A paper describes a structure:
Metallo-β-lactamases (MBLs) enable bacterial resistance to almost all classes of β-lactam antibiotics. There are two mechanistic types of β-lactamase – the serine β-lactamases (SBLs), which employ a nucleophilic serine (Ambler classes A, C, D) and the metallo-β-lactamases (MBLs), which utilise a Zn(II) bound hydroxide in β-lactam hydrolysis (class B). The enethiols inhibit MBLs from different subclasses. Crystallographic analyses reveal that the enethiol sulphur displaces the di-Zn(II) ion bridging ‘hydrolytic’ water.
The results reveal some SAR trends – some of the di-/tri-substituted amides and enethiols were clearly more active than the mono-substituted compounds. Thus, in most cases, the amides 5a-5e, showed almost no inhibition against all the subclass B1 MBLs (IC50 values ∼50 or >50 µM), when the para-position of the phenyl ring was mono-functionalised with halogen or alkyl groups. By contrast, e.g., the mono-ortho-substituted 5f-5i (IC50 values 2.0–52.1 µM), and di-ortho-substituted 5j (IC50 values < 2.0 µM), and 2,3,6-trifluoro 5k (IC50 values < 3.5 µM) analogues did manifest significant inhibition for all the tested B1 subclass MBLs, with the exception of NDM-1. Similar trends were observed for the enethiols 6a-6L, although IC50 values are mostly in the nanomolar range across all the MBLs tested. In each MBL the thiolate interacts with both Zn(II) ions and the inhibitor carboxylate interacts with Zn2 and (Lys-224 of BcII/Arg233 of VIM-2). The enethiol linked phenyl rings of the inhibitors all occupy the same region of the active site. As observed in the VIM-2:ML302F complex, the plane of the phenyl side chain on all of the enethiol inhibitors is rotated about the C3–C4 bond such that it is not co-planar with the plane of the enethiol alkene, likely hindering conjugation.
Residue numbers in the entry: 36 to 257
The structure:
């Protein structure tokens, strides 16, 4: 697939189909680069992102790269939980007039932790349409965090698992300070029950996979 990088290599976009790309950014933490993934949706009414990035500098540069390439503005972002990889660029979004969608719980947690607040407009199931691009958001229950949601593209059967879903390279659950490891299995089961025919699964970190990433996450939770 087509892969396009910034000069530093810290931001990359990879094409999944004509209108759907994965964005990946490296956040540097004590000398260790840590990548994280979101989506870029190229719609007839603008660009929509699933997730920002670790901080405002990276978010600014991601927006600028995609607006230049796709020749449209970023209009909306969906924030999938209130950790820095997802929400760290919220100040940039607000000051540019980019709408930052989230559940109410994600917005409360953002505020509790000193971030600017997203809209708190998403429910347990929300169906959005941007141009011709359909987007469903789903709260499956607690897992990696109490608030994590997934994003589904029904025209492509693409699931953005976010940090609820571990990549094949993840050999443990990672940081579980804010996680609910009992509920996590049930939450993944709720995803597997809702979306029974999945073409790709985008984890929060690591390589794109398929429903096997869900099953891998269930095994890590044993
Ligand atoms: O494993 C992950 O998906 C994530 S988001 C871990 C994590 C976290 F628990 C707290 C803060 C943060 F900045 C993080 F990156
Ligand atoms: Zn997280
Ligand atoms: Zn994460």
């Amino acid at each position: 697939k087509t892969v396009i990088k910034n000069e530093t290599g810290t931001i990359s976009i990879s094409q999944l189909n004509k209108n759907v790309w994965v964005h990946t950014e490296l956040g540097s933490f004590n000398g260790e680069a840590v990548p994280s993934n979101g989506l870029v949706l190229n719609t007839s009414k603008g660009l929509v992102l699933v997730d920002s990035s670790w901080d405002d500098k990276l978010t600014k540069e991601l927006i600028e790269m995609v607006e230049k390439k796709f020749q449209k503005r970023v209009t909306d972002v969906i924030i999938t939980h209130a950790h820095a990889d997802r929400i760290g660029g919220i100040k940039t979004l607000k000051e540019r007039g980019i709408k930052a969608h989230s559940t109410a719980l994600t917005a409360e947690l953002a505020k509790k932790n000193g971030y600017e607040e997203p809209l708190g407009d998403l429910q347990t199931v929300t169906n959005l349409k941007f141009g011709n691009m359909k987007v469903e958001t789903f709260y499956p229950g607690k897992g990696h965090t109490e608030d994590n949601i997934v994003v589904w593209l029904p025209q492509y059967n693409i699931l953005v698992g976010g940090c609820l879903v571990k990549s094949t390279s993840a050999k443990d659950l990672g940081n579980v300070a804010d996680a609910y490891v009992n509920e996590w299995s049930t939450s993944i089961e709720n995803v597997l029950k809702r979306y029974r025919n999945i073409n790709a699964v985008v984890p929060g970190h690591g390589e794109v996979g398929d429903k096997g990433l869900l099953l891998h996450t269930l095994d890590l939770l044993k």
